[PDB]
RNA sequence: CCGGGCACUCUAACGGGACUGCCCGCGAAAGCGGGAGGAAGGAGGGGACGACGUCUGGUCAGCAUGGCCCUUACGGCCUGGGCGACACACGUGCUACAAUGCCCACUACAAAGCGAUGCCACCCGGCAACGGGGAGCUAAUCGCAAAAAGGUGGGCCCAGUUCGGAUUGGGGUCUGCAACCCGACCCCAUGAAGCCGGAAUCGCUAGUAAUCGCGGAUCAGCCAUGCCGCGGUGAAUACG
């Protein structure tokens, strides 16, 4: 019963190194509750493209927050070797829920 | 309508509650 | 249909120094800048120049005038 | 339409007589999307033609508004500084067009109060031959024709 | 945006209803967000720059 | 046994499934005259079935979410004719004819800015 | 006044971010400010190193700050003497142990940044600007490249009323988002005003 | 039937024609009716000297209305007006009282507008 | 809800698909007009994209910047006032003038978003705004949240009306140091113009117009009927 949910902004990376725990896991645990989408939540930011007036123009940006469930049941002792300290993602967050 | 503070469209419309538009 | 709650509010700058101002008898003026203060009765029969944003207007308090404001006695823009 | 030369939308027939002649004097009805509203309005009507008289409504319709559908009508025209009002004939999908709107908008002018009513009751009087939608029509007609002397202007 | 108004910061408000996100780029003091501490305008230049993580141009 | 299509429409879908029987159909559970009631459309969600003289061999269990209640009439005219063609694909012949088997794409199209809504554009003044 | 940046443009393709890492709604502006403090003080001090870009990277408290330059020498200084001068007058407006890499732009003259402050520079040098443009694009249009352009603003040799001169070779098809041209503006400091230099390079496609 | 000060309300349903009182509305008309249980939807004409009695007592004791309003509304017009209080100097120069603003605009409380002459270019608009 | 299943719906990554490829007619080609097969047919819908340039267009008050100018002040602090004034005139809008409508009941179907010192279920006090207490959320898991138009039933019967809700008395709740100038929101009483608008003039060609409601940024609160999005219902017409 490990879940760790994956949030990042980049859903490249936050999928690969979403697929790297997946592994470090299918060598030594359960089958694991594979790697589970869940909805984006998507910021929109939208401003008036030039300074002063011209309200009419605007320009839309959006944040996008990509997530991940993963999910390893079955504690396996021996997936915390390869899912210790052998990650590379640089904008992805981790949380380790059991 | 809309713009009768006291009626159920007065209350939606303006996005309140009250006497003439309870909480369910 | 005016309001404000439970706690009528009046600035103490001229609070106590309004019934400062009746621990020994009376007084005549006080110059105040705090319309924001709810006339409350240990004021009747005084006289308070409030501030338009300019100058003091003199104010003489009364019995009925109580629970309006100072600002309400001191009107602030100069029309025809 | 001054590129290609506008294709004229087909319309769902009807879901109570398969017509789409019917769907259309119910869009003519409708207000602000709302159909279901129309929808019934006329229905209801068909049903109040249906009381009042042994003949079917389907066919009280077809009857009122092949009356209301003006053979002619005058067009203007820019003419040395004058203007001319050029009377010329009225293609078949145009007839029925403004028989249609004619009728919903002679409907809506009557007195009764229920709509359902007045629908049906201008239905009446047009297939009767009476009743201002058809008189909207034969005053289309006056007009046009009565410019005979203007029709050398072929549209 | 003249210095002395960039004093903002102060959080000595005497009363926090004093308070006023500004601008932390420009001191832009009227279309300031509150997630970036960036006005409008910065907002959009630093975000074409790519210097805003995640932050694309919207469309759909 | 029973036969599966599913159905989409204006951005609803709908979950059919065709046994024999009767005409009954479960709509959500509420019979079909239950959830759309006097609706003057709905009728025709069950169209697919006239068109191949069915309806009168078949029963009917759909769920749909999502949507109004015309958009869901319609995904329920889709999975109708697209179950009762996965259970006889002859009837393919007979539907097209009349589109069944197509998906209307009509979809709210989207909001522009400067537009009071998409297409209608504000009002200028004495230009 | 049209056209957008080329790079904002381009960011979820050929392109990416420099600044790599997820935040909250409650973090996200102060791992901004600061780490946007720190392209603040490295651009004014690696000023001659010529640094074209400035990538950050964040973690648990962590940073990567890999700048990239032209000559890596005058970033770490006798050594090693400045890199870590520059690494810890860095950690000490952030107390978050920083990491600093000095990366080395292979051929400075496929970096539009660079370009541009070239062209930028000599112009505050009372330089012949259409000269510096014309000389900029084939410098740049001969270090391979399959395209390549300058844009100087205007108030030209300090010339009353300004103007806009620019020139170009190559391609530079800014409405093809498979691209991939690296922009860089400049800007140009005088005794009459500023000046804005721009600089496209079209260097790779799909 | 009569209740209130010289009221005559009828051929309508109690309690709208109730209504036709000055100081009673929607509200009260609905409180009265059913505080003295008389279907709100009897015709007055086919109401009771009973029913009618029972609600002139209640209505012409539980409120102050008509005429007694009227005054006393105008009193207290009177009365902020007597004191160098603002709002009343609102009603006296006749505008709204409620800081609601006169540029453009605040005609039922100004009535027909008095129009006059002023500039041509400088495009007003 | 349990068990436990992923098949569906969906979620979100990655791919498949459309090419005038196939058929007939025209053509010299390009490419027309038709047919089949298909979810989709000839840029399938809608976006982001706006050339060399033109208005000595806009912005020195976003920022940057050359040059003038002030420096016990044209710099700075504060309390208060003013940006909210009102004989008038115009733009953009909102709500209407009603029966295809307005009320009150009861019931059904959406999408997008937002939620620490914040969404706030539920219960209790109050007609209510709101107040107490208090579960859950760290958010496909809890909450905002009722969608509304619709449907079923009942009332109103053509009246300035059970239309319309301006204005004006009252009595209150909130936020906030503080609501006189100058805040929303309840509740009672008021119940104005308005019977569809002269000359003129605006938008929109299909899921468009029209209509209904929902969210968000900014934000203590709010004067948002603004703006940027969202999804229900869903037309008319285009000879030319
Ligand atoms: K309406
Ligand atoms: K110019
Ligand atoms: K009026
Ligand atoms: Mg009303
Ligand atoms: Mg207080
Ligand atoms: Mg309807
Ligand atoms: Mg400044
Ligand atoms: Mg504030
Ligand atoms: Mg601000
Ligand atoms: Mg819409
Ligand atoms: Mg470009
Ligand atoms: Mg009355
Ligand atoms: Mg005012
Ligand atoms: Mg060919
Ligand atoms: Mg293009
Ligand atoms: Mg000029
Ligand atoms: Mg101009
Ligand atoms: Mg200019
Ligand atoms: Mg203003
Ligand atoms: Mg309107
Ligand atoms: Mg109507
Ligand atoms: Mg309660
Ligand atoms: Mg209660
Ligand atoms: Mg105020
Ligand atoms: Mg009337
Ligand atoms: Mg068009
Ligand atoms: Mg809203
Ligand atoms: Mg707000
Ligand atoms: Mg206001
Ligand atoms: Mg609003
Ligand atoms: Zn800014």
């Not at chain 6, 009071?116 to 200028?124: E, G, S, T």
């Not at chain 7, 603040?40 to 408290?61: F, H, M, N, Q, T």
């Not at chain 8, 009182?21 to 009265?32: D, F, L, P, T, V």
Request: proline content about 4%.
């Amino acid at each position: 019963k490990i879940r760790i949910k994956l949030r990042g902004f980049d859903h490249k990376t936050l999928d690969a190194s979403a697929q790297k725990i997946v592994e470090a896991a299918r060598r030594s645990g359960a089958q694991v509750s594979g790697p589970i989408p869940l909805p984006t939540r998507v910021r929109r930011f939208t401003v008036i493209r030039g300074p002063f007036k011209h309200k009419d123009s605007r320009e839309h940006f959006e944040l996008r927050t990509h997530n991940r469930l993963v999910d390893i049941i079955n504690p396996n002792r021996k997936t915390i070797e390869q899912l210790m300290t052998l990650d590379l993602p640089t904008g992805v967050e981790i949380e380790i829920k059991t | 309508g809309k713009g009768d503070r006291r009626t159920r469209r007065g209350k939606i419309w303006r996005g309140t509650y009250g006497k003439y538009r309870p909480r369910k | 249909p005016r309001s404000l709650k439970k706690g009528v509010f009046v600035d103490d700058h001229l609070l106590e120094k309004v019934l400062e101002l009746n621990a020994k008898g009376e007084k005549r003026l006080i110059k105040t800048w705090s319309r924001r203060s709810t006339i409350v009765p240990e004021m009747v029969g005084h006289t308070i120049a409030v501030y338009n944003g300019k100058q003091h207007v003199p104010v003489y308090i009364t019995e009925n005038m109580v629970g309006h404001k100072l600002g309400e006695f001191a009107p602030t823009r100069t029309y025809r | 339409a001054r590129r290609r030369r506008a294709e004229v939308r087909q319309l769902q027939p009807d879901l109570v007589y398969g017509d789409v002649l019917v769907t259309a004097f119910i869009n003519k009805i409708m207000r602000d999307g709302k159909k279901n509203l129309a929808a019934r309005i006329f229905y209801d009507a068909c049903k109040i033609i249906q009381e009042k008289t042994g003949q079917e409504p389907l066919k009280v319709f077809k009857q009122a508004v092949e009356n209301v559908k003006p053979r002619m009508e005058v067009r203007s025209r820019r003419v040395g500084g004058a203007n001319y009002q050029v009377p010329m004939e009225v293609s078949p999908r145009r007839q029925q067009s403004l028989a249609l709107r004619w009728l919903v908008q002679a409907a809506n002018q009557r007195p009764e109060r229920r709509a359902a009513v007045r629908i049906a009751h201008e239905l009446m009087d047009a297939a009767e031959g009476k009743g201002g939608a058809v008189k909207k029509k034969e005053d289309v007609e006056r007009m046009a024709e009565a410019n005979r002397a203007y029709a050398h202007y072929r549209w | 945006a003249r210095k002395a108004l960039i004093e903002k910061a102060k959080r000595t408000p005497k009363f926090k209803v004093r308070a006023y996100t500004r601008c932390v780029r420009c001191g832009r003091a009227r279309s300031v967000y509150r997630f970036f501490g960036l006005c409008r305008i910065c907002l959009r230049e630093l975000a074409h720059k790519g210097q805003l993580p995640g932050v694309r141009k919207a469309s759909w | 046994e029973q036969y599966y299509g599913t159905g989409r429409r204006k951005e609803a879908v709908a979950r059919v499934f065709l046994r024999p029987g009767n005409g009954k159909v479960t709509v959500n559970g509420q019979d079909f005259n239950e959830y759309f009631q006097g609706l003057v459309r709905a009728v025709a969600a069950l169209e697919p079935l006239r068109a191949v003289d069915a309806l009168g061999r078949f029963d009917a269990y759909i769920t749909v979410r999502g949507g109004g209640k015309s958009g869901q009439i319609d995904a329920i005219k889709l999975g109708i004719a697209r179950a009762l063609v996965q259970y006889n694909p002859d009837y393919r012949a007979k539907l097209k004819p009349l589109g069944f088997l197509t998906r209307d794409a009509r979809v709210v199209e989207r909001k522009k800015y400067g537009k009071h809504k998409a297409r209608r554009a504000p009002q200028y003044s004495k230009r | 006044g049209n056209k957008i940046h080329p790079i904002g443009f381009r960011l979820g393709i050929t392109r990416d971010w420099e600044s790599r890492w997820y935040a909250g709604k409650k973090q996200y502006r102060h791992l901004l400010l600061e780490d946007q403090r720190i392209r603040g003080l490295l651009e004014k001090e690696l000023y001659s190193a010529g640094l074209a870009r400035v990538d950050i990277e964040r973690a648990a408290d962590n940073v990567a700050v890999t700048v990239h330059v032209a000559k890596p020498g005058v970033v770490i200084g006798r050594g090693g003497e400045r890199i870590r001068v520059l690494r810890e007058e860095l950690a000490k407006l952030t107390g978050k142990n920083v990491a600093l890499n000095v990366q080395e732009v292979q051929n400075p003259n496929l970096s539009a940044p660079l370009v541009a402050q070239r062209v930028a520079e000599q112009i505050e040098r009372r330089f012949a600007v259409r000269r510096a443009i014309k000389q900029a694009v084939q410098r740049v249009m001969e270090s391979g490249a399959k395209g390549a352009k300058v844009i100087v603003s205007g108030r030209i040799g300090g010339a009353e009323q300004a103007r806009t001169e620019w020139a170009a070779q190559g391609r530079v098809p800014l409405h093809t988002l498979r691209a991939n041209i690296d922009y860089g503006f400049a800007l140009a400091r005088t005794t009459y005003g500023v000046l804005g230099v721009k600089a496209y390079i079209f260097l790779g496609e799909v | 039937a009569r209740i209130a000060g010289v009221e005559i309300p009828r051929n309508k349903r109690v309690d709208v024609a109730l209504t036709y009182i000055y100081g009673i509305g929607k509200a009260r008309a609905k409180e009265a009716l059913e505080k003295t249980g008389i279907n709100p939807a009897t015709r007055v004409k086919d109401l009771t000297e009973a029913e009618v009695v029972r609600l002139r007592e209640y209505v012409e004791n539980t409120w102050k209305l008509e005429g007694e309003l009227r005054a006393e509304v105008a009193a207290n017009i009177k009365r902020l007006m007597d004191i160098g209080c603002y709002r009343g100097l609102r009603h006296r120069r006749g505008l709204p009282v409620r800081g609601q603003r006169t540029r453009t605009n605040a005609r039922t409380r100004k009535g027909p507008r008095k129009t006059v002459a002023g500039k041509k270019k400088a495009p007003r608009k």
